[PDB]
Structure 1
């Protein structure tokens, strides 16, 4: 009811609408703005001309207000003290203004070893602070010129930031619809203030003087002249709150050194809304704690570390500090860290207990996964307490098969060591799926295209319609896809993109990261059938979809013959494809690119398993050679089945592909693909 409140404001009369027609019982302005308080202060004005009615207006206009007051300037907090002091000490109880507040923005005082590098629990981390500049009023009392001055001074500081803090400023006045659309996508844009901010006078001269700064990494974000002069945000996926706090402090302290902030001993940093006083800080973490949420100690942990939990997928909560006043920013972050760590240990207890016994669901005879076939309780009990150097357990490896009972295999490797440490399971699975290959036989890799003699089969394209060869590779030195930490995944993306951008000739192309993928870029790539989406339930349970879509992307050449998927199911899925028949050309292109990547980075590889992958089906050559070919006549001939078995290739309604991956080189596999097709099309002249 803006129109009603204006009538009282125009008379400078007591705001009757506070006398609950439908006013919030908890409303602090209703509680502390009494007739005598109003009478005592209604004629007082700050140097900036802020009145009591200016400060209380939002709370009278918006009767559902929890707080209902905004300060126009620093003087408002003293001049209208009797009102603000009561509101502050009630909202921030048991804080006492007489006690005082101590700020601390030294990140070195924070002790925060990274809680969750593997991202088993924590999804994202974010720290926000609100700050106001010296020499000016607060948001409701800022003049038109002052706001422009603030924009000018802040941008000057922000545009001179270096390192990971370097970035771009986007003012709201103007902003191409293109730019706007992009910022909405990143969730970096703020809109006109809601009814609470409107009634506080915060939307004055919208959108003049308002703007957005972000660094190139998009891990640092500043809102200029929104609810306060500055809303400064440091954030990233994963759990590294110490890193997040450090980046925040570097930027905030630099701005403070050049401009200075509004700050008192009793209020801490000054903000428009009294709720944001003190640290002006909200430190936050998104974390999956379904089991901890139901533990009886849950609420007592929140109370103990002074944190709160809010609903956001399933079991994922927003954990943030409850306190602003009476504690330092350092103490606030530390309490956040300790509370989250405590809740994480709870979650780890429940999961460890549940993983301590043999998965009873595997005892069902309707389950026909390889996991069920080979994993006995005795084998489980022999392996269950063991972990690789990266902390990968047996249960980590079989999790997808236990969560998805309809798995064909159900077992993934988090790292190379899994194939050794959990050999009594992996050996059986490998030798079963890749039967009759024996691990003792060892495997020979060979990516020399000159050792293939494959003259073109069907240059008319009479039968063969297209030729596709894919290889799966993983980068040496890292875990496999299910076991990747956040930093590993990003590091792999950076290195591979660095290599792919050095590719010349017809290998030249560019990289399309899934993160920051607009609309025009997406739907296009999809038409080419180049786009890959998020993994399914099997990959999710394996740990392949962690931090999606961070670090994922697509590279293709101009001719669209050479394609690379980065950090999908394997770290590198490399595809060469074209035309109709020339198997020898596809492979030559494939080898040129793969060998160059191999030379710069290296691949995970053993004698026994060939090229390593998270999924045992992709071992050895890690290669799929496929032929699309019209063969009506030979498919019914009594030699067709003799042929497929003799050359160990499979035919599927008419996809012609290799069945073998282990115990043969890539040269040998391609040559056999050729020869098999050669005798198949041979009958297409019966």
Structure 2
């Protein structure tokens, strides 16, 4: 809706912008509201030291009649020299703030008291704090000279590239940027392009793109936009709820630039920005939180009003963007504290509602047509006796059974959040384990054996006539942490870091590289699809169990150069380790698998008990956590009346005229014994197709 032509005719005559009376103009426009003919004539001949006029400031609002505010400050002096205009605009926008009152700034993180609100990521999805800042000694963005914009870049980059620790990173200037860098920054949502029709008419687009640039730390949790709408747009953000950490990281960086360079700042306005809407703190603090039940709640609006925050909706059903509505009259510390307390109060509403509905027996389980293992063993008696206990990591019975409740068509419907779940909720888990893993009894206990030399497997089909492929997978979880459904944000990131650290140290047969899912370009994605190495987000069963939290943060893929060794990280289990080969050499596949699994084990360790073997969030993956597969062509021995008599002696099953043959048992036998059985069974099947 930009009409630059019409405005230019009024600007060149230094005449009152008549378009501000054209019915299409925004009724709520502040420049329309407060730029009266008497204001205009009183100021139309005034100019700042930098040459900024009244028309320069108001121009964007006349070009873009749909403007909410409609004015931009060319410099600091513009706020005072055109005071009769800016004051009325500021006190309208920032109501009930009064310029006479004064503003107080506070960038000391220690003043904020904010223990991590939602480490388990049950409700809060992401946290983001933005500040706008302008350097001492220069004009603001609409009025900065060509040389000054460059000098600002030079000084800012000098400070930013000296940043240490988690703030260390790289600067990417827009001028000279190549296509690969441009795409990387687009994929990370870090890029900004030429200003819209609002920045254009404000004169902010001058000399594009000279002096513009992007800085970001290696973690990609800190972002700086240089010379966009203001000199500095500084952003601290991350998934999860730790706003205390976010504000701490922001202030460490901001105060460093402050001490070395200095910001434009007054008592009246706080920190000076191009648009008056960004005065004071220059801050936008935001949190994304799934809060469906609290919205319905009668005290919802009162909490927002109390803490001066607002809620806007944006997969993300029930998810709201909570953010501050004030920038003047409160400090940065105060803005974050209201933000913290406000979210906390909102989260407590959502928690109360969920607690109430989780207080009673899942009535939906009373339907006789629900044939899940959950319904079979979860009597109201058992439910009542367990419903109020929680593990050391905050896992409850309802957390464990939630997927089976939400998904009535589950076969099992029960997941474990941590190791303690298998003991604390043993009345439920024991019966489910022994049912699915029948005839195994927990008292028998389980023996793990990852010694490949204890397997006697001379190659069956070296010709490659019958057995096309052989594949052995094991599911594993890293010791010292919760299981996948109960992982906190920092646990999942720790698991990725340490596992990646181990896999990179692998040599010989197992040397390879790691592809994280976060920030993966389309080229890598495609070539992983070709090899069938790429995994996607979990289904509705895993979603309801809490497995898909913060996707895809902390998820990644590793494979060796020979395409014979694959590791999925933080998918369904923390570690899904697969050995693959062409042909029939099971002993070679298992040997390679053992070499890698044993090394990861020594350096990191696995979650393991005598009664369950290796622990998984999914009770189906206990014991060996192993699926051994043989893709074999058997048209004839599939018919010999000794198929059952062999497929049952060696506990194997057949599907897939090529047939996939897999082990049926995971619990009660060792990995060695399981592999040996698959061998012994396929051998006799091959002693019939021979």
TM-score bracket for the superposition, by shorter chain length: over 0.9
Stretches of structure 2 lacking an aligned partner (at least 5 in a row)? none
Match of residue 440 from structure 2? 437
Deviates more, 1:17-26 or 1:146-155: 17-26
Q: Counterparts of 2:11 and 2:22 in 1: how far apart (Å)?
A: 18
What is the aligned counterpart of 1:554 among 524, 539, 557?
557
After TM superposition, give the deviation of residue 22 of structure 1 in Å.
1.2
Q: Counterparts of 1:31 and 1:141 in 2: how far apart (Å)?
A: 24
Q: Counterparts of 1:483 and 1:21 in 2: how far apart (Å)?
A: 58
Q: Counterparts of 2:13 and 2:580 in 1: how far apart (Å)?
A: 79
The secondary structure found in structure 2 opposite 1:672 is helix
Q: Counterparts of 1:106 and 1:537 in 2: how far apart (Å)?
A: 43
After TM superposition, give the deviation of residue 646 of structure 1 in Å.
1.0
Match of residue 615 from structure 2? 612
After TM superposition, give the deviation of residue 186 of structure 1 in Å.
0.6
Q: Counterparts of 1:252 and 1:480 in 2: how far apart (Å)?
A: 38
Match of residue 43 from structure 1? 45
The secondary structure found in structure 2 opposite 1:472 is strand
Q: Counterparts of 1:278 and 1:20 in 2: how far apart (Å)?
A: 33
Deviations 1:131-172 (CA, angstroms, capped at 9, x unpaired): 000000101000111111111110111111111111111111
Q: Counterparts of 1:544 and 1:135 in 2: how far apart (Å)?
A: 52
Q: Counterparts of 2:454 and 2:129 in 1: how far apart (Å)?
A: 58
Deviations 1:579-613 (CA, angstroms, capped at 9, x unpaired): 11101000000000001111011100000000000
Q: Counterparts of 2:509 and 2:583 in 1: how far apart (Å)?
A: 18
Match of residue 185 from structure 2? 183
The secondary structure found in structure 1 opposite 2:142 is helix
After TM superposition, give the deviation of residue 190 of structure 1 in Å.
0.7
Q: Counterparts of 1:366 and 1:204 in 2: how far apart (Å)?
A: 69
Q: Does 1:122 align with 2:124?
A: yes
Deviations 1:10-52 (CA, angstroms, capped at 9, x unpaired): 1000111111421111111111111111111000000000000
Deviations 1:287-337 (CA, angstroms, capped at 9, x unpaired): 000111111111111000110111111011100111100110000000000
Q: Counterparts of 2:458 and 2:685 in 1: how far apart (Å)?
A: 15
Match of residue 661 from structure 1? 666
What is the aligned counterpart of 1:597 among 597, 600, 610?
600
Q: Counterparts of 2:465 and 2:6 in 1: how far apart (Å)?
A: 82
The secondary structure found in structure 2 opposite 1:373 is helix
Q: Counterparts of 1:520 and 1:25 in 2: how far apart (Å)?
A: 49
After TM superposition, give the deviation of residue 477 of structure 1 in Å.
0.6
Match of residue 376 from structure 1? 379
Match of residue 531 from structure 2? 528
Query: Cα RMSD over matched residues?
Result: 0.6
The secondary structure found in structure 2 opposite 1:319 is strand
The secondary structure found in structure 1 opposite 2:627 is strand
Deviations 1:338-378 (CA, angstroms, capped at 9, x unpaired): 00000000000110001111111111111111011111111
Which of structure 1's runs of 4+ aligned residues deviate more than 6 A? none
Q: Counterparts of 1:558 and 1:504 in 2: how far apart (Å)?
A: 11
Deviations 1:203-229 (CA, angstroms, capped at 9, x unpaired): 111111111000000000000000000
The secondary structure found in structure 2 opposite 1:575 is strand
After TM superposition, give the deviation of residue 281 of structure 1 in Å.
0.2
The secondary structure found in structure 1 opposite 2:234 is strand
Match of residue 641 from structure 2? 638
Q: Counterparts of 1:41 and 1:141 in 2: how far apart (Å)?
A: 18
Stretches of structure 1 lacking an aligned partner (at least 5 in a row)? none
Q: Counterparts of 2:363 and 2:686 in 1: how far apart (Å)?
A: 51
Deviations 1:369-407 (CA, angstroms, capped at 9, x unpaired): 101111111111111111100000000001111111110
Deviations 1:413-465 (CA, angstroms, capped at 9, x unpaired): 00000000000100010000000000000000000001001100000012111
The secondary structure found in structure 1 opposite 2:638 is helix
Q: Counterparts of 2:312 and 2:214 in 1: how far apart (Å)?
A: 27
| TM-score, structure 1 normalization | 0.99
| TM-score, structure 2 normalization | 0.99
After TM superposition, give the deviation of residue 64 of structure 1 in Å.
1.0
Q: Counterparts of 2:672 and 2:73 in 1: how far apart (Å)?
A: 76
1:466-477 matched pairs, under 5 angstroms: 466-477=469-480
The secondary structure found in structure 2 opposite 1:70 is coil
Match of residue 30 from structure 1? 32
What is the aligned counterpart of 2:652 among 628, 649, 652?
649
Match of residue 517 from structure 1? 520
The secondary structure found in structure 2 opposite 1:139 is coil
The secondary structure found in structure 1 opposite 2:506 is coil
The secondary structure found in structure 2 opposite 1:494 is helix
Q: Counterparts of 2:587 and 2:564 in 1: how far apart (Å)?
A: 14
Deviations 1:225-276 (CA, angstroms, capped at 9, x unpaired): 0000000000000000000000000000000011100000110000011110
Match of residue 67 from structure 1? 69
Q: Counterparts of 1:613 and 1:137 in 2: how far apart (Å)?
A: 60
Q: Counterparts of 2:347 and 2:451 in 1: how far apart (Å)?
A: 50
Match of residue 507 from structure 1? 510
The secondary structure found in structure 2 opposite 1:446 is coil
After TM superposition, give the deviation of residue 648 of structure 1 in Å.
1.0
The secondary structure found in structure 2 opposite 1:635 is coil
Deviates more, 1:105-114 or 1:179-188: 179-188
What is the aligned counterpart of 1:300 among 274, 299, 302?
302
The secondary structure found in structure 1 opposite 2:649 is helix
Q: Counterparts of 1:292 and 1:24 in 2: how far apart (Å)?
A: 34
Q: Counterparts of 2:628 and 2:598 in 1: how far apart (Å)?
A: 18
After TM superposition, give the deviation of residue 633 of structure 1 in Å.
1.0
Q: Counterparts of 1:434 and 1:496 in 2: how far apart (Å)?
A: 29
Q: Counterparts of 2:37 and 2:643 in 1: how far apart (Å)?
A: 98
The secondary structure found in structure 2 opposite 1:218 is coil
Q: Counterparts of 1:279 and 1:31 in 2: how far apart (Å)?
A: 25
The secondary structure found in structure 2 opposite 1:214 is strand
Task: Give aligned pairs, total.
Answer: 684
Q: Counterparts of 1:399 and 1:515 in 2: how far apart (Å)?
A: 28
The secondary structure found in structure 1 opposite 2:432 is helix
Q: Counterparts of 1:642 and 1:453 in 2: how far apart (Å)?
A: 22
